[PDB]
Amino acid sequence: SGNTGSIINNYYMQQYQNSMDTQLGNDWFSKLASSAFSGLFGALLA
Amino acid sequence: SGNTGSIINNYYMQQYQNSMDTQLGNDWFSKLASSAFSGLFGALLA
Amino acid sequence: EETTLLEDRILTTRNGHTTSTTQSSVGVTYGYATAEDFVSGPNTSGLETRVVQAERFFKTHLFDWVTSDSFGRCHLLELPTDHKGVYGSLTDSYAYMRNGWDVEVTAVGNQFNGGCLLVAMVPELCSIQKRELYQLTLFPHQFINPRTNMTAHITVPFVGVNRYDQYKVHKPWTLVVMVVAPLTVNTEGAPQIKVYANIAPTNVHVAGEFPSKE
Amino acid sequence: TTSAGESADPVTTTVENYGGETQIQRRQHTDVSFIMDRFVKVTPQNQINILDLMQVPSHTLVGGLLRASTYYFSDLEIAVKHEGDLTWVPNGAPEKALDNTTNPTAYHKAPLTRLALPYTAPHRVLATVYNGECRYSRNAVPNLRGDLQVLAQKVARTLPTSFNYGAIKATRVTELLYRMKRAETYCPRPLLAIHPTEARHKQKIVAPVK
Amino acid sequence: TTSAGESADPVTTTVENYGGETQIQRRQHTDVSFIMDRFVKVTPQNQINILDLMQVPSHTLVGGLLRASTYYFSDLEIAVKHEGDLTWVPNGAPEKALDNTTNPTAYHKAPLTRLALPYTAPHRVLATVYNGECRYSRNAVPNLRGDLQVLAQKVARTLPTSFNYGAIKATRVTELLYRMKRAETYCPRPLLAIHPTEARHKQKIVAPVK
Amino acid sequence: GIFPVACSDGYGGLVTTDPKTADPVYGKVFNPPRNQLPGRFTNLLDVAEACPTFLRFEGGVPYVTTKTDSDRVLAQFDMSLAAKHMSNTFLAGLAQYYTQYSGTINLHFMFTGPTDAKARYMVAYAPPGMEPPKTPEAAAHCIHAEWDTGLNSKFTFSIPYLSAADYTYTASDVAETTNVQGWVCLFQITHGKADGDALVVLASAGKDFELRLPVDARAE
Amino acid sequence: GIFPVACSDGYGGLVTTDPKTADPVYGKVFNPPRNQLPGRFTNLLDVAEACPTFLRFEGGVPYVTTKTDSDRVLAQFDMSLAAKHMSNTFLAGLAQYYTQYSGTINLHFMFTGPTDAKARYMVAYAPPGMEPPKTPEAAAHCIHAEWDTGLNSKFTFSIPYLSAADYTYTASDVAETTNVQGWVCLFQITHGKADGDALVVLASAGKDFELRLPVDARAE
């Protein structure tokens, strides 16, 4: 997903090539840049 | 099943890569650790 | 915004049995998140508890903004700081703690003053070179600019490499107030502006109760 | 547009405000995973090298951009030029473990060894900067108040001992490169260009031939 | 909880007894097959080496943990650094067979030879410890009774001749590593940490840079 | 027999940027949970848009003060990400690791004077090919905006990407087509008692700002 | 023609821990039957839970005898798997081959005095950050349990995993966050004629005890 560009699957298992992530129970700055006011606050003449 | 992590099958037959096991006719310590009393032997107040 | 010589941008914040009201509001800045992440993880083995009695405002003086302070004059306050109340007593009764911060900074002069203050909440502030002060807006912030407002309000969560902290050895947040444009007093402004913080810990959780000295 | 400058709410105008037209942008190159995922050379120690991303010089692309985050996560690749065999040991190992070959040891095969390593720290994330101590037996850290001067107490601090991806050791290690895999970055921090003496920073840029 | 201590029935309490909560555990690393399945170096004999797992030093991870079982099974991998060609012969072979190339012989290819070998002993399982003799022509073994002193008669015993994975021979073997494949362990036996002089055994653990 | 294979010359050496991954040696590790950590960013241009950083004016200050004389030029600098005025921005700090950009750069202007201090300002984009205007009147013929002070302290303006080529360089060499893109001109039309008051200016990336072609060139 | 292949630099050397298997040379062998052999274990933490081993107290004994004076501290040691008190346990013998652990460690206490010998004991977990309690009264404010003697000779107590990080180290260096986890405190409240009687203590792995990251570090 970074800079990798092989079209065939890894010979090794994912359990081996990378650490495995666990859960309990872009993101912020994407939401922040999308929320930006892009308008005009006056009244527009012409 | 130990420390092996290849996703494709072995080029050699299993008869060659490993000794073959025979039958006649975890296990104990798993059963032993599962059987452990985890409770309380009193009566619980509050 | 709203009306003649003074204003109705009017906010009342409540934290516990303490309230604070401003009539020159400008809104609150939420830093990095809108909620805390999970408070109950593996590292506390279910033994943690919330202590709602510490979630309330305490106050400290920060500095006096005067006409000789130049761009880049800062005042840092590392958080947590000395608290002689129930939050402060938690840090001596429990080994591990976590809480976010609801921060309110005041700079009251009047609307005939000029100049501008940036207030910001920086994590892990160990050093800041002069040139980096041009990028302090990277952090959760708000300005205080006399012609508009006298209050800044930033609400920030707990952050850290670890889910619960030991505050006797690590300070996750530093409040920084920075002068971006020097104070002008002209004939009618306040001769100087004292800057005060009103801070509330939010969501305080403690784990790992200490012995006493008995 | 006019707005309330004190707010901190981002305001992004467009050239449409005076009759232009916003174009499409392809931002694949400023994606954190992609840009962090290239090797960067470090100056190695003769023999024991602890794998610590804060070793990559702050001016490099990966050092520049890694320091622009407070907390980060990644797996790691290293490529190492070394004499003898290379042993790696996880985060938390005794340093004398570096001499035992059951720990991941790679036998010399010219010209270099490239290894995929897991994140092994005991923390959910690591930090480029940390305002505190990991040694216990001390006296409590002060609650500093004051201006920038107050921050000079902290300069003799080393990042916690747990902030590493283990360590490697070989008879001589000659070259070491790190490459961050699957990188995540949280809480931006300052990124500084060179400060010019002149109105514009000028450099010889790569141009045709004669 | 209270229980009858004399019983030997395992009693496992949890932090729930005083309001905590038991977490999930991922125990993939203390699985016998996985942990036994890594190479470990042995000090080789110049030429003939009989393949005997009890040759791996007792302090190593694989020696430590192999001696914590009474009976075991596995297949084997070896990697060998050698001059000439390497011949291996199964359990039960005459030692002069080590010189005949129809027996599995590997021709020298730099830097080393790694081979998958089957379990060949005549026993369903092998043992790290065996309280008896394999030579017949003797007098019967005593039925010892007494305290620990009585066990000193047994020190001159070598493990039965059938307890091996064959033997290998090359002109010079310089390095030999074993790796247990598909390992099974039965009847745990003591596993000893280092005994500290002090209250805590302290070691330099791998820490950042400066 | 076995599969025949041509081991090819020219292929196989380590490349520091290549699309391939190393062979793993230490399996099965499970990380501590890190889901829902605050403050994640994905794309460096998300934070370049959402967080403007300050420009630098003579004296090493983020503002221009309103002058009170006949010179109405408050600032004039090269539309270059390598400008001295831009050199402490997050945008210039990002741009140095890329060889080309495209799109909109936004300037923000905040008035910092008292309530009885009033002013009217103009920002104009002067494109290359003739000398940048010295007067608001000459500047009127450029793409420009004018605004004054009031309730709202901030005005934001998009500098347009106008060039012959589709991309231009982030680095500069000597004044050429590919590396100077003209000037931005900040003028003061007039003021009413704003003598000495600061206007502070910031810059952020526009909605179609784009950086491409990573480069490492020593530098920070 | 034939299939072209890039033989890659950096790949191919022997690694002592790698995920790959050797080429076989001696086929077709069939083993003696070994199904249903007694005593198999799969997971070393199965036997670390099911079989507690003895702690070590001063003198090289698995017990503490009830003292009869004003000092009520029966034992106090570092919550470390590298403690001297833990050094003959199966748990410390396993832990040395791993760099990190998590979870519960259980202590077992067995009274060994005659029937007319009675006592009341307290075990408390003292977390790091201040000095461990010297008195049952100071210790009352810790997570603690108290019990007395009767029919049932054994009491078992779970030491909780409480730390900032999610894992902590099995080895120790110098007192830090990652390697000392506070103290366990064993007190005697009182006794009735138990003078000289031994309480013997054992430790076993709790239900969520976890060891990760194998390491070989000389040692046994």
From TrEMBL, chains A, B:
Subcellular location: Host cytoplasm; Virion
Source species of the chain: Foot-and-mouth disease virus serotype O
Name of this protein: Genome polyprotein
Protein purpose: Lies on the inner surface of the capsid shell. After binding to the host receptor, the capsid undergoes conformational changes. Capsid protein VP4 is released, capsid protein VP1 N-terminus is externalized, and together, they shape a pore in the host membrane through which the viral genome is translocated into the host cell cytoplasm. After genome has been released, the channel shrinks.
From TrEMBL, chains F, G:
Transmembrane segments: none
Domain Picornavirus capsid: 32-186
Compartment list: Host cytoplasm; Virion
Protein's job: Lies on the inner surface of the capsid shell. After binding to the host receptor, the capsid undergoes conformational changes. Capsid protein VP4 is released, capsid protein VP1 N-terminus is externalized, and together, they shape a pore in the host membrane through which the viral genome is translocated into the host cell cytoplasm. After genome has been released, the channel shrinks.
Name recorded for this polypeptide: Genome polyprotein
Organism: Foot-and-mouth disease virus serotype O
Lineage, opening ranks: Viruses, Riboviria, Orthornavirae, Pisuviricota, Pisoniviricetes
Residues of the full protein shown: 288 to 507 of 720
